[PDB]
């Protein structure tokens, strides 16, 4: 979600952002067409329940005790 | 009429049905080899279809007083203020100043 300070101006139409438009119905399959997204699933238990894209954050950083490095647990992983 | 006649433009026998751009120039369907004078007459009419013919190429031809003297001068003059004279009388209502 939060990778950009400046969002693009060709994505807001006269109503609604273009990437916020629920485009799951255009898929050809069934299981990803199924939406079980709960309304209040902010940091839930799955990602199909999210209804948005995941937000970027780092939440725990420690220095390495040996080799001049530091590891940060991110949304993208570690 | 004609200010020049190309002598080596009549003996030429171009084909027409070999390229799709020239395949719209056929009038019958049993003609493929057409001489140049018919071909350059056909290609003139096809060019008249693509680009039209505006009226100024035909209606106008340049070839005790006069009435179009103001129209002639306005065509040949592009700046109209009497400022190139340096008239030694300053123009009223406007002032050209420079600050140093």
């Amino acid at each position: 979600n939060g990778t950009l300070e400046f969002l693009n101006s060709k994505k807001m139409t006269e109503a609604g952002s273009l990437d916020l438009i629920d485009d799951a119905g255009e898929n050809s399959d069934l299981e990803d067409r199924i939406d079980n997204s709960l309304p209040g699933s902010q940091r839930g238990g799955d990602l199909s329940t999210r209804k948005m894209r995941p937000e970027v954050r780092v939440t725990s950083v420690q220095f390495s005790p040996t080799a001049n490095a530091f590891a940060a647990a991110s949304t993208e992983g570690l | 009429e004609a200010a020049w006649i190309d002598s080596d433009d009549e003996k030429i026998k171009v084909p027409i049905l070999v390229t799709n751009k020239t395949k719209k120039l056929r009038t019958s369907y049993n003609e493929s080899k057409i001489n140049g004078v018919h071909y350059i007459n056909r290609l003139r009419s096809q060019f008249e279809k693509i680009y039209p013919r505006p009226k100024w190429v035909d209606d106008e031809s340049d070839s005790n007083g006069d009435i179009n003297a103001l129209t002639k001068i306005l065509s040949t003059t592009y700046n109209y203020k009497d400022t190139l004279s340096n008239s030694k009388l300053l123009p009223p209502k406007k002032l050209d100043i420079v600050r140093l």
Partner: protein
């Protein structure tokens, strides 16, 4: 002069140099192909994005440019080059030591004209060849047939005829046989440019004295003599939409539009290109659409649109003024200072001797901007100084940027030549900031710097 550490990439920040560019139709879209020195670039029409450059640079300057549907024909010092996609697909060599000046292509007959009054004809070997490669013949214009070859044009619906315009007369060449078939009467003025017309057998000739002589090549007689007062004529084109508009481009930075139906003027665009760099070198309409693309020696390339008429019923009389559109450009001068705006190697700030400051992009060549010298309003409520007739800032000689704290305040300090204050610039807003930093000891600034935190700027008197 070879290197084992660095190797050239491209020349960032150039659009045009002043050579008359070419444009080529390609289905519905158009591509504007220009040249910059020893290379050449291909610009799209509807967005002015750079599409292709030459993969390998030419050994010398590109003198003549022409473009068919796909194959762009570049003409440098001795040889002409047939390129597609920027790739050197074929090199066509001219077997003479003189220099190529003009390059016409019609049909299977490429028409290369050297400077010493010789026209080379190049023939496609196969009728389905994509470019001419074999050498047909070498037409020669003597000193009794005319002057030097001003241009080579091929008029519409002429079977194997080449129209040659000299400084004094117009000639025709049956290139299949290599024979002169018609000579025009002598023109007392020196012809400077030539252009075909949507009407048949009509070529437009622009002279150094401001006369547009419109020569009907069938009757061998002129038709319309359009007079322009004492201006050197450089460009000629017609609006091929159907409305009768003739665009004549002076070298003094003026663009004059004529309504040939009503025999009247339309608009005189002033200063679309600078005087000293050549002015309006090449300016032509896109074929069938009211968008005219102009370019000159000022390293810029502008587009102008004729809007549809405000009157619902009259139309042709009340015609709209031409209106500015897409434009890509660079400095008219060589650039003095260059810095880098970020650690991503994205943006390059260049301040030139053209009294400006540009933020080029190494990633996308259409992302470049000219950073605005529009002063902010003073916080005190007192009106700022400077001239009412606005001019640009003096030439910038020292520069410093900190990318740490960007967009919340000013992050560029630039130092101008012979000025007793440095100026602030905001990189994110792309605009001159609201603070000037005086030396407070009566001194020009010769060096400036930033802290890495970005809060502090240092000024050297």
């Amino acid at each position: 002069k070879n290197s084992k550490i660095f190797s050239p990439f491209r020349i960032i920040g150039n659009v045009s140099n002043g050579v008359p560019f070419a444009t080529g139709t390609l289905g519905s879209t158009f591509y504007i192909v220009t040249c910059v020195g020893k290379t050449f670039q291909i610009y799209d029409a509807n967005t002015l994005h750079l599409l292709f450059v030459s993969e390998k640079e030419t050994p010398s300057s590109i003198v003549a440019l022409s473009a068919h549907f796909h194959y762009v024909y570049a003409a440098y010092e001795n040889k002409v080059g047939i390129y597609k996609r920027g790739i050197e697909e074929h090199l066509l060599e001219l077997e003479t030591d003189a220099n190529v000046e003009h390059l016409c292509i019609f049909g299977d007959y490429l028409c290369a004209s050297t400077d010493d009054n010789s026209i080379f004809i190049y023939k496609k070997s196969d009728p389905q060849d994509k470019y001419p490669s074999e050498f047909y013949t070498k037409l020669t214009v003597t000193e009794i047939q005319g002057g030097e070859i001003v241009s080579l044009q091929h008029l519409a619906t002429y079977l194997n005829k080449l129209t040659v315009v000299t400084k004094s007369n117009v000639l025709l060449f049956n290139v299949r046989t290599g024979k002169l078939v018609f000579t025009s009467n002598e023109f007392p003025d020196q012809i400077t440019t030539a252009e075909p017309a949507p009407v048949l057998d009509i070529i437009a000739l622009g002279t150094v004295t401001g006369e547009v002589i419109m020569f009907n090549m069938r009757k061998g007689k002129r038709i319309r003599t359009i007079k322009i007062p004492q201006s050197r004529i450089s460009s000629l084109s017609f609006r091929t939409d159907g409305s009768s508009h003739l665009s004549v481009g002076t070298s003094s930075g003026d663009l004059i539009f004529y309504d040939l139906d009503r025999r009247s003027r339309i608009h005189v665009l002033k200063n679309i290109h600078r005087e000293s760099y050549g002015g309006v070198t090449q300016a032509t309409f896109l074929n069938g659409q009211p968008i005219i693309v102009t370019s000159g020696g000022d390293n810029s390339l502008k587009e102008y649109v004729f809007d549809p008429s405000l009157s619902q019923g009259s139309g042709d009389v009340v015609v709209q003024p031409p209106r500015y559109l897409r434009s890509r450009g660079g400095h008219s001068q060589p650039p003095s200072y260059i810095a880098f705006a970020d650690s991503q190697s994205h943006f390059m700030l260049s301040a030139s001797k053209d009294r400006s400051l540009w933020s080029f992009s190494l990633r996308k060549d259409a992302q470049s901007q000219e950073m605005s010298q529009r002063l902010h309003k003073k916080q005190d409520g007192g009106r700022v100084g400077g001239s009412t007739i606005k001019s640009k800032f003096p030439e910038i000689v020292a520069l410093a940027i900190e990318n740490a704290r960007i967009g919340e305040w000013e992050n560029i300090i630039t130092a101008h030549k012979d000025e007793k204050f440095a100026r602030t610039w905001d990189m994110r807003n792309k605009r001159v900031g609201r603070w000037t930093f005086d030396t407070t000891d009566d001194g020009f600034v010769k060096s400036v710097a930033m802290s890495q935190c970005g809060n502090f700027g240092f000024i050297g008197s």
